[PDB]
Amino acid sequence: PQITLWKRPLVTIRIGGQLKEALLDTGADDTVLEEMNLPGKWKPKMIGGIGGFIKVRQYDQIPIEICGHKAIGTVLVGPTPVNIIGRNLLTQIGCTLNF
Amino acid sequence: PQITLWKRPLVTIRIGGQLKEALLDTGADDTVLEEMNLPGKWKPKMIGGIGGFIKVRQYDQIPIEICGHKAIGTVLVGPTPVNIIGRNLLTQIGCTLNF
Numbered sequence A, B: 001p002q003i004t005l006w007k008r009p010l011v012t013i014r015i016g017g018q019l020k021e022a023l024l025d026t027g028a029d030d031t032v033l034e035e036m037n038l039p040g041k042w043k044p045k046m047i048g049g050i051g052g053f054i055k056v057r058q059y060d061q062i063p064i065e066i067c068g069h070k071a072i073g074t075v076l077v078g079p080t081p082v083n084i085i086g087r088n089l090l091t092q093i094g095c096t097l098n099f
């Protein structure tokens, strides 16, 4: 599909049996999700943006479904105000910028 | 052009006869540039990102040529971690997400 940018590029994602709205974000290196208690091992990390840094938990090899497309990779979990699908997963679902 | 996302979508922009590198950032509502001088009146503004809120200077009706495509619109100047082109200008240059 094609998504114009008049509004925020929010789409439905699925991780386990939680469905969430998340930004398709070309400015995000990594995928950052709102606080959720995912199973398995993780590592602490700090990521920076406008306003400074937040602390996140890095979970690896998490399957995630984005608009019916299958992805699997690293997801950072922490106190972000919005769910952010970053480039690590955008490539997996075949996402490009075009103009 | 078509831009893939295995690397950061950094492009050369021209603003005030100056060449800068900026990130095409679909998760950003606004276009935010690192500290620089621009002519004319500005308004104090505050914006929020992943790490909290910052103060920026709001310049309106500023021409920027992004990867050869002309835009004229609002540019915020302040302590962003990197120059970002947000949706306000991405729409002007006809940028869409496709997968």
Ligand SMILES: CC[C@H](C)CN(C[C@@H](O)[C@H](Cc1ccccc1)NC(=O)c1cccc(O)c1)S(=O)(=O)c1ccc2ncsc2c1
Residues within 6 Å of the ligand: A025, A027, A028, A029, A030, A031, A032, A047, A048, A049, A050, A081, A082, A084, A086, B025, B026, B027, B028, B029, B030, B031, B032, B047, B048, B049, B050, B051, B081, B082, B084, B086
């Ligand atoms: C450095 C370039 C940018 C600012 C990085 N950010 C992505 C950017 O699209 C973020 C995404 C976002 C949206 C809404 C609330 C919080 C965050 N956008 C913004 O900061 C933003 C948003 C609205 C208006 C505005 O002027 C700026 S990010 O801070 O969210 C981010 C995301 C993923 C990531 N992975 C490693 S560092 C890192 C930082």
